[PDB]
Amino acid sequence: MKVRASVKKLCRNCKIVKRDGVIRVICSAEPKHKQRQG
Protein backbone atom coordinates (compact mmCIF):
# COMPACT_ATOMS: atom_id res chain seq x y z
CA MET A 1 0.00 0.00 0.00
CA LYS A 2 0.85 3.73 -0.70
CA VAL A 3 -0.96 6.27 1.56
CA ARG A 4 -1.99 8.95 -1.02
CA ALA A 5 -5.06 11.26 -1.34
CA SER A 6 -8.00 11.17 -3.85
CA VAL A 7 -9.16 7.67 -5.08
CA LYS A 8 -9.68 6.99 -8.88
CA LYS A 9 -10.74 3.80 -10.57
CA LEU A 10 -7.67 1.89 -11.94
CA CYS A 11 -9.44 -1.25 -13.18
CA ARG A 12 -13.06 -2.38 -13.80
CA ASN A 13 -13.05 -4.25 -10.40
CA CYS A 14 -11.88 -1.49 -8.16
CA LYS A 15 -15.00 -1.42 -5.98
CA ILE A 16 -13.71 1.41 -3.80
CA VAL A 17 -15.06 1.00 -0.21
CA LYS A 18 -15.00 3.29 2.89
CA ARG A 19 -13.39 1.58 5.88
CA ASP A 20 -13.24 3.89 8.93
CA GLY A 21 -12.79 7.56 7.88
CA VAL A 22 -10.39 6.63 5.00
CA ILE A 23 -11.57 5.39 1.64
CA ARG A 24 -9.62 2.20 0.41
CA VAL A 25 -9.39 1.24 -3.18
CA ILE A 26 -9.88 -2.53 -2.97
CA CYS A 27 -9.78 -4.34 -6.39
CA SER A 28 -10.40 -7.99 -7.29
CA ALA A 29 -8.67 -7.93 -10.77
CA GLU A 30 -5.11 -6.99 -9.60
CA PRO A 31 -3.48 -6.68 -6.09
CA LYS A 32 -1.55 -3.61 -7.66
CA HIS A 33 -4.49 -1.16 -6.95
CA LYS A 34 -4.56 -0.89 -3.09
CA GLN A 35 -4.47 2.95 -2.55
CA ARG A 36 -5.20 3.15 1.28
CA GLN A 37 -6.74 6.67 1.60
CA GLY A 38 -9.09 8.90 -0.48
Partner: protein
Protein backbone atom coordinates in the same frame (compact mmCIF):
# COMPACT_ATOMS: atom_id res chain seq x y z
CA UNK B 1 -32.57 -3.21 -0.64
CA UNK B 2 -34.13 -6.13 -2.57
CA UNK B 3 -32.23 -8.58 -0.29
CA UNK B 4 -33.42 -6.64 2.71
CA UNK B 5 -37.08 -7.41 1.41
CA UNK B 6 -36.58 -11.26 1.23
CA UNK B 7 -39.07 -12.75 3.74
CA UNK B 8 -36.58 -15.74 4.26
CA UNK B 9 -39.35 -18.23 5.35
CA UNK B 10 -37.16 -20.43 7.48
CA UNK B 11 -37.15 -24.31 6.88
CA UNK B 12 -39.01 -27.03 8.92
CA UNK B 13 -37.24 -28.45 11.96
CA UNK B 14 -34.62 -25.56 12.34
CA UNK B 15 -34.86 -24.10 15.85
CA UNK B 16 -34.64 -20.28 15.74
CA UNK B 17 -34.85 -18.92 19.28
CA UNK B 18 -35.66 -15.17 19.56
CA UNK B 19 -34.86 -13.07 22.73
CA UNK B 20 -35.89 -9.94 20.73
CA UNK B 21 -32.55 -8.79 19.20
CA UNK B 22 -30.45 -11.93 20.02
CA UNK B 23 -31.15 -14.95 17.79
CA UNK B 24 -29.77 -18.56 18.36
CA UNK B 25 -30.06 -21.06 15.36
CA UNK B 26 -29.75 -24.75 16.47
CA UNK B 27 -30.11 -28.13 14.74
CA UNK B 28 -28.10 -31.26 13.81
CA UNK B 29 -24.56 -31.41 12.38
CA UNK B 30 -23.07 -28.14 13.85
CA UNK B 31 -22.69 -26.03 16.93
CA UNK B 32 -22.37 -22.42 18.19
CA UNK B 33 -24.57 -20.67 15.58
CA UNK B 34 -25.68 -17.30 16.65
CA UNK B 35 -26.35 -13.59 15.80
CA UNK B 36 -26.64 -10.36 17.74
CA UNK B 37 -28.53 -7.94 15.60
CA UNK B 38 -27.59 -4.42 17.05
CA UNK B 39 -28.09 -2.06 14.04
CA UNK B 40 -31.47 -3.50 12.97
CA UNK B 41 -34.62 -4.96 14.62
CA UNK B 42 -35.58 -8.41 13.63
CA UNK B 43 -39.02 -9.88 14.15
CA UNK B 44 -39.31 -13.65 13.48
CA UNK B 45 -43.06 -14.19 12.74
CA UNK B 46 -43.51 -18.06 12.86
CA UNK B 47 -40.66 -18.36 10.37
CA UNK B 48 -40.80 -15.31 8.07
CA UNK B 49 -37.88 -13.09 9.31
CA UNK B 50 -38.81 -9.34 8.87
CA UNK B 51 -36.05 -6.66 8.92
CA UNK B 52 -36.38 -2.86 9.99
CA UNK B 53 -34.78 0.04 11.97
CA UNK B 54 -33.24 -0.31 15.50
CA UNK B 55 -33.23 2.61 18.25
CA UNK B 56 -30.11 4.80 18.23
CA UNK B 57 -29.02 4.12 14.61
CA UNK B 58 -30.01 6.21 11.48
CA UNK B 59 -28.72 3.88 8.56
CA UNK B 60 -31.52 1.93 6.70
CA UNK B 61 -31.83 -1.23 4.70
CA UNK B 62 -27.93 -1.36 5.07
CA UNK B 63 -27.88 -3.93 7.99
CA UNK B 64 -31.34 -5.23 7.24
CA UNK B 65 -29.98 -7.03 4.13
CA UNK B 66 -27.07 -8.27 6.41
CA UNK B 67 -29.50 -9.66 8.99
CA UNK B 68 -31.24 -11.49 6.13
CA UNK B 69 -28.09 -12.83 4.75
CA UNK B 70 -26.59 -13.81 8.20
CA UNK B 71 -29.69 -15.44 9.72
CA UNK B 72 -30.46 -17.46 6.51
CA UNK B 73 -26.78 -18.56 6.08
CA UNK B 74 -27.10 -19.94 9.63
CA UNK B 75 -30.34 -21.64 8.85
CA UNK B 76 -28.76 -23.20 5.74
CA UNK B 77 -25.69 -24.31 7.97
CA UNK B 78 -27.81 -26.54 10.25
CA UNK B 79 -30.22 -27.91 7.52
CA UNK B 80 -27.74 -29.46 4.85
CA UNK B 81 -24.43 -28.03 5.86
CA UNK B 82 -22.51 -25.75 3.51
CA UNK B 83 -19.50 -27.36 1.77
CA UNK B 84 -16.89 -28.56 4.19
CA UNK B 85 -13.80 -29.63 2.09
CA UNK B 86 -10.89 -27.11 2.25
CA UNK B 87 -7.33 -27.44 0.76
CA UNK B 88 -3.86 -25.86 0.20
CA UNK B 89 -1.21 -25.54 -2.62
CA UNK B 90 2.56 -25.36 -1.76
CA UNK B 91 4.97 -28.14 -0.85
CA UNK B 92 6.16 -28.56 2.73
CA UNK B 93 3.47 -26.24 4.38
CA UNK B 94 0.53 -28.59 5.37
CA UNK B 95 -2.49 -28.29 7.75
CA UNK B 96 -2.79 -31.81 9.29
CA UNK B 97 -5.42 -31.89 12.10
CA UNK B 98 -4.71 -34.11 15.12
CA UNK B 99 -7.73 -33.76 17.35
CA UNK B 100 -8.64 -30.11 18.26
CA UNK B 101 -5.21 -29.05 17.09
CA UNK B 102 -3.97 -28.16 13.66
CA UNK B 103 -0.35 -29.24 13.14
CA UNK B 104 1.54 -27.35 10.47
CA UNK B 105 5.20 -26.24 9.84
CA UNK B 106 6.50 -22.66 8.88
CA UNK B 107 10.20 -23.33 9.56
CA UNK B 108 9.64 -22.14 13.13
CA UNK B 109 11.53 -23.27 16.21
CA UNK B 110 8.41 -23.06 18.34
CA UNK B 111 5.33 -25.25 17.79
CA UNK B 112 2.96 -23.07 15.88
CA UNK B 113 0.05 -24.11 18.16
CA UNK B 114 -2.73 -23.28 15.48
CA UNK B 115 -6.05 -24.61 17.06
CA UNK B 116 -9.74 -24.80 16.20
CA UNK B 117 -12.50 -22.44 17.75
CA UNK B 118 -15.08 -24.33 19.99
CA UNK B 119 -17.73 -23.43 17.22
CA UNK B 120 -16.09 -25.80 14.67
CA UNK B 121 -14.70 -29.32 14.63
CA UNK B 122 -12.24 -30.92 12.01
CA UNK B 123 -10.52 -34.11 10.65
CA UNK B 124 -8.16 -34.76 7.73
CA UNK B 125 -8.08 -37.52 4.98
CA UNK B 126 -4.57 -36.25 3.92
CA UNK B 127 -2.02 -33.71 5.20
CA UNK B 128 -2.99 -30.94 2.73
CA UNK B 129 -6.78 -31.71 2.69
CA UNK B 130 -8.82 -30.51 5.69
CA UNK B 131 -12.58 -31.01 6.35
CA UNK B 132 -14.08 -28.47 8.73
CA UNK B 133 -17.61 -29.29 9.93
CA UNK B 134 -20.25 -27.01 11.53
CA UNK B 135 -23.29 -24.84 11.03
CA UNK B 136 -21.94 -21.29 11.45
CA UNK B 137 -20.99 -19.74 8.11
CA UNK B 138 -18.64 -17.11 9.89
CA UNK B 139 -16.46 -19.49 12.14
CA UNK B 140 -15.40 -21.97 9.46
CA UNK B 141 -13.95 -19.02 7.54
CA UNK B 142 -12.60 -17.29 10.74
CA UNK B 143 -10.26 -20.33 11.45
CA UNK B 144 -9.42 -20.46 7.73
CA UNK B 145 -8.74 -16.74 7.96
CA UNK B 146 -6.17 -17.27 10.77
CA UNK B 147 -4.73 -20.25 8.84
CA UNK B 148 -4.23 -17.81 5.93
CA UNK B 149 -2.48 -15.24 8.35
CA UNK B 150 1.06 -16.11 7.12
CA UNK B 151 -0.02 -18.42 4.28
CA UNK B 152 -1.98 -16.18 1.87
CA UNK B 153 -2.08 -17.34 -1.90
CA UNK B 154 1.11 -15.32 -2.97
CA UNK B 155 0.60 -12.66 -5.74
CA UNK B 156 3.19 -14.23 -8.12
CA UNK B 157 3.19 -18.00 -7.91
CA UNK B 158 -0.19 -18.28 -5.96
CA UNK B 159 0.73 -20.83 -3.15
CA UNK B 160 -1.31 -20.86 0.02
CA UNK B 161 -4.35 -22.31 1.69
CA UNK B 162 -7.24 -21.95 -0.92
CA UNK B 163 -10.88 -21.62 0.05
CA UNK B 164 -14.02 -20.12 -1.34
CA UNK B 165 -13.86 -16.49 -2.60
CA UNK B 166 -10.32 -14.59 -1.78
CA UNK B 167 -9.50 -10.96 -2.94
CA UNK B 168 -5.90 -11.42 -3.94
CA UNK B 169 -6.33 -12.67 -7.48
CA UNK B 170 -2.60 -13.41 -8.67
CA UNK B 171 -0.91 -11.26 -11.29
CA UNK B 172 1.66 -11.65 -14.00
CA UNK B 173 4.57 -9.77 -15.27
CA UNK B 174 3.71 -7.87 -18.48
CA UNK B 175 2.71 -10.13 -21.47
CA UNK B 176 5.22 -12.08 -23.62
Amino acid sequence: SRVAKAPVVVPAGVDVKINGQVITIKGKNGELTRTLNDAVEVKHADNTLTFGPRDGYADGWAQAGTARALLNSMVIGVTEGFTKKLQLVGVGYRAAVKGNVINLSLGFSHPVDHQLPAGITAECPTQTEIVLKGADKQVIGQVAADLRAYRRPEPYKGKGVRYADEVVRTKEAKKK
